[PDB]
Each structure stands twice: as structure tokens, then as C-alpha cells.
């Protein structure tokens, strides 16, 4: 029912442009006006640009006007945001979003698409380095031992640890990530009790988006 | 820009309860306030508009109020499937703007960290490094404090930390402190101690 | 204007039987009278014309005679897809005028019915409001006196009632008496009683 | 063969207008006078407008004369009724109908189309509340349970409820709308063979064509 799909994301070195586009499926596009909303990390959800129902008002925010651009396209049903002069301060998740049509000069966003993320940086694509989190044999608390893989140094996101299906206890806890120096690092641990392990080999499976697989335990 | 302020960003809220969540305007909005609900993944959902309109199908235990500059969202019987964090925005004056969001979380009876310390693999150390991990698992509350000593002092310089987010199954979180060390001052040393406080005790847990 | 009169609206006939149907006009309309058929689903057709002209394909059960001020639809072997409302109109003068119509029922085998009574929902009362539904399913006669007692008393105002039209595959009819209360007058009483009096029983469905 | 379909309906605010258009097809349009009949409720049919093949004659009801105008646009073609000054009584399903070209000057409608019905009213539109009707569990008098949904509060109608195309019992019985206090309300019930539910889930799916689809139960 009512769908907004994003599609422009990327990792852009500061300075450039980009065009985010958006796809409306779900209703008579032309009857609503659209908006763009961005969720930048730690800082907030910021509203970035608005185009009127069909064309009357393209309507900008102080922080992007002059770089940002709101292009509609009714017949073809896609909303665009072309960007230029992109600053680091723009790295973010961009949401295409519908208008409202409910009441009184109110501007609300009745529908939101997936997010379509955008990192503006310079730093360059590094593969993650998997490492074992091994204890020795048994060693946790009881007769269950926790293990880990430290994946250390990558840039950009997602890097993934996949571990083992086969719960008879198998809790993987992945600590979420943090930047250090420009690279991300994170860990996923899982706990197998006693018999299992060192009896038959556990493994981490690490994938990073910019196409590498590491494998270990 | 009216600044929008949601004061109180975390709320252990239990289940079957009303959450009031509050929002307040720098200028007086004209009761133009609206509430969006964002959950775990992406998800912004709209929830109520014009201080009070529930959008279609938002199921009616959600309710809001507000008049002047000051506003709040109310949930009547908090259900496990409403646990998402919540934002309030102004659809009255350019730039339209946003409450920064209240994450909301599940209370549970306390508990304590199953610690583990972990030394450099061989891999690592080959490369120059020495990262030591200490992972205090399953617990509630979020708050677990953690320390690192080398050979009889605190290591401040060096640590880094992150928590799991809250676990589905039982609401308990996990967390990993890690001193990243080079292999040379790993070689400067002998005991490494991760040691932790935590509402559930009184002995550090080491 | 002329006034067409069909007295008889619901009229229930078994499958098989002659059905004569009766129309009456205020003036000597003059055999200019016509018969139309209305289906359970919109669908209008001409059945018979110039008081006796069969439209094509119209099936022979179908026969009407009439004159000066009085005319009629006789079906002779009632088939099932022949149940529907039937109007007529003089197509004599201006403005053209129709007779209101005859709903034509599957007279059937009686059946005692099955009462269900759902408490106001979680959500409604969180809406603040309460509708108590009492559902009486499948019966035959249509006629069904209902009644509600809040701690034993009658409720008189607070009740809407409605029926479906004979079920399509079994000629049976069902009822929904809603009593609507206020979350507030609601919480004051316990018993909610829905209670049916029905031709197939000599004691009251409760 | 002999297809007439109508085209202008709506919820219209009182005082205003619509013009209804009819696509004729299956015979030669010119040779027949057309007529418009309406069916507003509690009452029944009401003749309402007519035009000769070709246009020499229009004959209107006492009821809408002054306000309405019939039109014929012949080539294969079309027919019209342009309304204005809509007294709410004019709410109904308007039908489109061929004459007869039969006999003697009689007035008789040879074939009907389905109607675009016209809601004369300001009520503004409300999509509705779907409220779920439930037992405590397990019951009819015994086994089978009749689940129910309460969709209550809307305007203008319809609303269509659909349930479980699930032969298990799955008779669904919708009751009729009772409009009260403006809004209209209705319930939908189904008996499920209690072996199911809450064994396996159910869903009342409510869609009221002025755009919401709500889901529940």
C-alpha cells in the first residue's frame, strides 16, 4: 500500500554532487507535494527541501539552498534531489517522504521511504580484518564458552558478522560499532556450551559490502 | 527556527502502561504538533497530526495533547510492539523542525554481567597490535561501568566501548571494553584487569 | 402525477409457486404499463412491456394482465434467480412514475439461532468508547425480538439493530444488536445481557 | 451486447455540481431517445431526464427542471446530464437508459447501465475505525468461534471487509451499515472451526474506497 523507494546512495568524496531520486507507487503522485528529510548521526532528523504538489513551490532549507535541488517528474512518478558542492556535514540517511493533505497549513509527512544513505568522505575503502575471540577450551563461566571475532579497521559500512545457526544455545551478541581514527571496528560474540567446542569447529563469517569475505574461528 | 525540545530521551517503561511523552516548542505553534514513530530499522511511521489526529489505523491506545508551546504523546497500554523511539516536529514555520526523539525501553529485573577477558591472538600481535577485549554479557540495567588496569593502574588512555542494543528474547544488554594496545607495551606488562561496577553489586566483577 | 401503487413488498414464496405480483395506478393509465426486475446487485432489466409484452429471452413464467387502473405480475413456476425486487411504472405521461417495489423472499424452514456476545474492545474503550455487539446468526424468521439487560434491567436507548438479507446459499438471516456505552457508564455495571426471543423456541435465548 | 456505462459520480458538496456522462455502445446511438432514471433510497426510482434521438425534445422532471440539462453527443458516442444546484435529495445512483422504439409512444426503458451514484452532502469524508470483536477464546455454543470485526464510524460509504478465503468456515456474514449520528457502522463475523485460532491467525481486512485499507483482528 503507498510506496516511496529511494535509490541514489553512495559514498562520495567531499565536493561533488549527487542526485537522489525518488520513486512513488501507491497513489496519485501528482496530487501531493513531496519533501526530503535527512537523519544525520548523533545530530538530528533534519528536513532538507520540499517540492509542491505538481510544481508550484520548490521550497528550500537554509542549510542546503544553493547546493540542493528538488526536481519533480510527475508523468514518470519519480522525485529527485540533485546535490552539488557536497560537504562532509551532509553525510546521512535521506528520506523521500510524502506530504499530507490533512489540515490547515500543517506540514506533515504521511509517508516515508526506506532511507537512502549517503556518506560524504575522503577516507578510502578498507576491507575488515577478522580476528578470533578465542579463550582456550571451556572457559567462560561454566560449561558454556563465549567466543568472538573482532573485525577491525574497515570503512564504509555495513561489514557483517554471521556466526552459526544451531541454537541449543547459540547466542551471538554483536556489539554495535564506533569510529576510531577514521575506521570502524566491532565484535560479535556467541556462546556455545561445553561439549561443543573445541569438539567441532565454530567459525565467523565476515562480509563487507565492498566485496570481501573473511572466515574464521 | 523554533527549537523543538523533547526532554527525557530514554524511558524503561514496563508493558500495559501509558507512556506520556512530551514536547515543547520555542515559539507557540498553533497546536501544529505531530509525532512520528521510528523503529529499529528504518521505519519512520507517522502517528498523530495537529496535536491530535491519529492517522489511519494507528490503533487507538496512542493519543496526544498540547496547546501553546507545550506538548506530550500518551500511550495507554504500553505493548511490546510500540517499543521504538519517538520524535515530535513542527508543521508551522520554515524550517519545519524535529523533537530530538525519546528511545523507550523495557524494564526488567536486574542482573549481572557474565565477564570474559580475552588476550591478543597471534594474528593480531603479528601485525603490531594488542587489543584486549573484556565482555560483560547479559545484564540489565544498561549501565555497567568498566575499568582497566595495567600492572596496578588504571588504563584510561586507550579504551573503547559499545553496548549490544537491548535483547529481544530477554531485554538484557551486552557490552565490550577493549584496550587496543600495540604488541610492544603488551610486552611492557603483566596483568591486565577489566573490572566492573553495576547496579547489581557491590563487588566489582572482575 | 399518476400514482402507481404496489401494496406488497416482501412477499415470500416457495421455490416452485405461481407468484402473482400486484401494481395499481391513480389514473386510467391505459395498458401503457411496464414491469422491471431489480437484482441483488444493481442490475436492472425490462421484463415485460406494453402491459403484456415479453421482452426477448424473458422466460415464460413471466406473464402480466392489467387494465385501466389495475395490473399484475404473475410468475408461474418460481425459479431462484427470479427472486429480486420488481417495480413497474406507467410509461404513459410525464413525469414517468414507478411503483416502489416488492422484495421477494425465500420462505423457509424455521431455525432457532445462535447468539454471540463480544465485550467492548481493548481499543474502543481506549478510544473512550464502548460498543457491545450481540450477534444472532443464521436464523429464519427474520423476526427476532432482541433485548439487552445491564445488571438486569432493560436497556432501551443505546441499541442499534441490523440484519443481512437472506443468505445467499441457505436463505438464513443474522442480527447484530450493538449497545453503545461510554467507557464511563460502561465500567459502572457488570452484567451485560443480550437476550433473544425467537419463534423456534419457547424460552428466551440469553 | 448493448452496453451503457455511466461516468460522473462523487460525494459533492451541496450547492455545487457534476455533469454525468454515459458511454453508449452496441447499436446505433442516433436512432434512440435516451433517458436518465434515478434511485435515491428508502425511496426508489425516479425518472429524471430524456432526449430524443438527435435532440428535438428534452423532457425533465418537475423535480430537477431549472437545475439540470440533458445532452447527447452522437457519433457512436455519448450522453450527459450536467447537474448544478444540487439539493441533497438529489443523492442516488443515476441510471443511463435506452428507450424502446417499440410501441405506440409508450415510455419504456429498453436497457439500463449501472449508475455513478451521487452523494449530495458536506460531511467531509472520514475513513473509519476497524475495531476487532473477540471472545475470550474457543467458543460458539462450543467449538467454532465466530470472530468479528466492528468497523464503525465512516462516511461516505462503502467500506468492504474481507476476511479469510479459508474454506474452514469461512462463511463471512457482513451485517449492513446502520448510519447513525452521521457516521455509518457495520460488523463482519466469521465462524472458525476452533481447531484453529489462535492456533493460526486471522485478519479482518477493511478497505473503504476513499483510500484507506485497514487491517486487523
Amino acid at each position: 500500500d503507498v510506496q516511496l523507494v529511494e535509490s541514489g546512495g553512495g559514498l562520495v568524496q567531499p565536493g561533488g554532487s549527487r542526485k537522489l531520486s525518488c520513486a512513488a507507487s501507491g497513489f496519485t503522485f501528482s496530487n501531493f507535494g513531496m519533501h526530503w528529510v535527512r537523519q544525520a548521526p548523533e545530530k538530528g532528523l533534519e528536513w532538507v527541501a520540499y517540492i509542491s504538489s505538481g510544481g508550484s513551490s520548490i521550497n528550500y532549507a537554509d542549510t542546503v539552498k544553493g547546493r540542493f535541488t528538488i526536481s519533480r517528474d510527475n508523468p514518470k512518478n519519480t522525485l529527485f534531489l540533485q546535490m552539488t558542492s557536497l560537504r562532509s556535514e551532509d553525510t546521512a540517511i535521506y528520506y523521500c517522504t510524502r506530504g499530507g493533505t490533512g489540515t490547515r497549513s500543517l506540514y506533515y509527512f504521511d509517508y516515508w521511504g526506506q532511507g537512502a544513505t549517503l556518506i560524504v568522505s575522503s577516507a578510502t575503502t578498507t576491507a575488515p580484518s577478522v580476528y578470533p575471540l578465542v579463550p582456550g577450551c571451556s572457559d567462560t563461566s561454566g560449561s558454556s564458552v563465549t567466543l568472538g571475532c573482532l573485525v577491525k579497521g574497515y570503512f564504509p559500512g555495513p561489514v557483517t558478522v554471521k556466526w552459526n545457526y544451531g541454537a541449543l544455545s547459540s547466542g551471538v551478541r554483536t556489539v554495535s560499532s564506533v569510529l576510531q581514527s577514521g575506521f570502524y571496528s566491532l565484535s560479535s560474540l556467541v556462546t556455545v556450551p561445553s561439549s561443543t567446542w573445541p569438539s567441532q569447529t565454530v567459525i565467523c563469517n565476515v562480509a563487507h559490502p565492498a566485496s570481501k569475505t573473511d572466515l574464521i574461528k | 527556527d523554533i527549537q523543538m525540545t523533547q526532554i527525557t530521551s530514554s524511558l524503561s517503561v514496563s508493558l500495559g502502561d501509558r507512556v506520556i511523552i512530551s514536547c515543547r516548542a520555542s515559539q507557540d505553534i498553533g497546536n501544529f504538533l505531530n509525532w512520528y514513530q521510528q523503529k529499529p530499522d528504518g521505519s519512520l511511521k507517522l502517528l498523530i497530526y495537529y496535536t491530535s489526529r491519529l492517522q489511519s489505523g494507528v490503533p487507538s491506545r496512542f493519543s496526544g495533547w498540547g496547546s501553546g508551546t507545550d506538548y506530550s504523546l500518551t500511550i495507554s497500554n504500553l505493548e511490546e510492539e510500540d517499543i521504538a523511539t519517538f520524535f515530535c516536529q513542527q508543521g508551522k514555520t520554515l524550517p519545519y523542525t524535529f523533537g530530538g526523539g525519546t528511545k523507550l525501553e523495557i524494564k526488567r529485573a536486574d542482573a549481572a554481567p557474565t565477564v570474559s577477558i580475552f588476550p591478543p591472538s597471534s594474528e593480531q600481535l603479528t601485525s603490531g597490535g594488542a587489543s584486549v577485549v573484556c565482555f560483560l554479557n547479559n545484564f540489565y540495567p544498561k549501565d555497567i561501568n568498566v575499568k582497566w588496569k595495567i600492572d596496578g593502574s588504571e588504563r584510561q588512555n586507550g579504551v573503547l566501548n559499545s553496548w549490544t542494543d537491548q535483547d529481544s528474547k530477554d531485554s538484557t544488554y551486552s557490552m565490550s571494553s577493549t584496550l587496543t594496545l600495540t604488541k610492544d607495551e603488551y610486552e611492557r606488562h603483566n596483568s591486565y584487569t577489566c573490572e566492573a561496577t553495576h547496579k547489581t553489586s557491590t563487588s566489582p566483577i572482575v
Side-chain angles (χ1 to χ4, degrees), chain A, chain B:
Chain A
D1 189 284
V2 166
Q3 279 193 162
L4 319 192
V5 156
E6 278 102 334
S7 214
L11 192 165
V12 184
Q13 161 226 124
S17 14
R18 256 276 166 104
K19 192 213 284 166
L20 254 32
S21 62
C22 178
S25 48
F27 208 123
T28 333
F29 186 56
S30 48
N31 245 209
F32 308 76
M34 284 290 145
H35 299 282
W36 275 98
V37 218
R38 59 170 167 183
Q39 185 155 31
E42 180 286 341
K43 289 164 156 187
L45 243 186
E46 228 202 315
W47 166 77
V48 92
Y50 156 56
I51 203 197
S52 184
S53 164
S56 357
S57 316
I58 283 196
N59 196 165
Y60 284 131
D62 295 290
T63 223
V64 309
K65 188 38 198 327
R67 285 71 57 44
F68 285 63
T69 298
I70 288 256
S71 319
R72 194 144 182 142
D73 207 85
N74 298 45
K76 249 304 181 181
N77 255 94
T78 301
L79 161 62
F80 297 101
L81 171 55
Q82 159 104 51
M83 298 146 231
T84 212
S85 239
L86 274 149
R87 297 147 42 217
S88 289
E89 325 70 269
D90 287 331
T91 165
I93 314 75
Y94 273 79
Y95 303 86
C96 159
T97 278
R98 182 225 245 194
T101 265
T103 337
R104 305 205 161 90
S105 188
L106 182 79
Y107 287 34
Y108 60 99
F109 317 132
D110 167 2
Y111 290 85
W112 285 86
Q114 299 79 101
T117 153
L118 179 46
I119 304 152
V120 173
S121 181
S122 281
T124 195
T125 291
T126 343
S129 290
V130 195
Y131 294 136
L133 279 176
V134 58
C137 327
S138 45
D139 55 4
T140 288
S141 302
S143 302
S144 251
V145 217
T146 313
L147 286 326
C149 278
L150 161 291
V151 347
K152 214 257 163 47
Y154 38 107
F155 191 76
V159 79
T160 44
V161 181
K162 225 47 154 179
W163 264 111
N164 69 255
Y165 212 126
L168 37 317
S169 169
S170 2
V172 24
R173 302 292 134 188
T174 322
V175 176
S176 189
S177 188
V178 35
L179 249 164
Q180 145 166 189
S181 324
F183 295 80
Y184 284 78
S185 244
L186 75 106
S187 35
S188 186
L189 290 314
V190 53
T191 36
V192 271
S194 356
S195 9
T196 258
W197 191 63
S199 19
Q200 62 295 64
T201 312
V202 242
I203 276 181
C204 25
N205 210 134
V206 184
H208 187 16
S211 305
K212 84 129 277 109
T213 357
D214 277 2
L215 155 68
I216 230 144
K217 213 328 73 167
Chain B
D1 298 307
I2 312 199
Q3 279 133 266
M4 216 46 7
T5 331
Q6 256 176 315
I7 22 289
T8 286
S9 49
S10 3
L11 230 70
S12 196
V13 38
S14 315
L15 237 85
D17 12 42
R18 174 188 302 268
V19 186
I20 197 165
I21 303 204
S22 298
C23 173
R24 186 216 213 285
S26 85
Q27 265 89 106
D28 179 346
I29 266 31
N31 260 275
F32 280 94
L33 189 150
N34 302 321
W35 280 95
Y36 293 81
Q37 190 197 2
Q38 150 156 50
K39 25 198 272 143
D41 26 317
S43 328
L44 280 130
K45 188 193 313 183
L46 181 250
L47 272 168
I48 275 155
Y49 49 116
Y50 209 48
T51 286
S52 325
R53 302 294 143 72
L54 240 70
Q55 106 90 7
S56 40
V58 151
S60 54
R61 81 195 85 108
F62 288 92
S63 206
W65 348 59
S67 192
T69 53
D70 304 296
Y71 304 55
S72 326
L73 181 77
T74 289
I75 312 197
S76 21
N77 224 244
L78 207 125
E79 268 185 359
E80 49 268 292
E81 17 297 312
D82 292 357
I83 141 175
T85 118
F86 286 55
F87 299 108
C88 52
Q89 77 132 17
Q90 69 118 353
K92 160 91 204 130
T93 290
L94 264 54
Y96 299 84
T97 40
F98 277 116
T102 293
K103 210 289 194 181
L104 171 161
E105 84 148 286
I106 340 330
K107 262 186 179 71
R108 183 194 180 300
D110 299 15
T114 1
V115 161
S116 276
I117 174 173
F118 287 93
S121 52
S122 358
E123 296 51 32
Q124 238 187 341
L125 320 163
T126 274
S127 298
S131 275
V132 177
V133 168
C134 178
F135 181 163
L136 342 114
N137 235 328
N138 313 54
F139 63 88
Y140 186 49
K142 213 173 72 253
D143 313 353
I144 199 246
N145 200 75
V146 166
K147 329 180 41 215
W148 279 93
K149 309 145 129 70
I150 306 155
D151 271 358
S153 184
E154 257 71 73
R155 176 64 181 263
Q156 182 61 333
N157 268 33
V159 183
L160 234 174
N161 302 52
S162 332
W163 292 235
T164 18
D165 198 78
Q166 169 161 79
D167 187 292
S168 1
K169 185 215 171 278
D170 48 64
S171 338
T172 52
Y173 318 37
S174 290
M175 188 279 205
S176 298
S177 169
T178 307
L179 241 150
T180 300
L181 275 180
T182 288
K183 159 170 133 318
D184 245 76
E185 196 201 0
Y186 185 38
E187 276 136 13
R188 301 209 160 85
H189 290 352
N190 286 252
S191 301
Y192 293 108
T193 309
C194 149
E195 155 181 327
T197 305
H198 175 258
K199 165 135 182 301
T200 38
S201 165
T202 323
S203 38
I205 165 306
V206 160

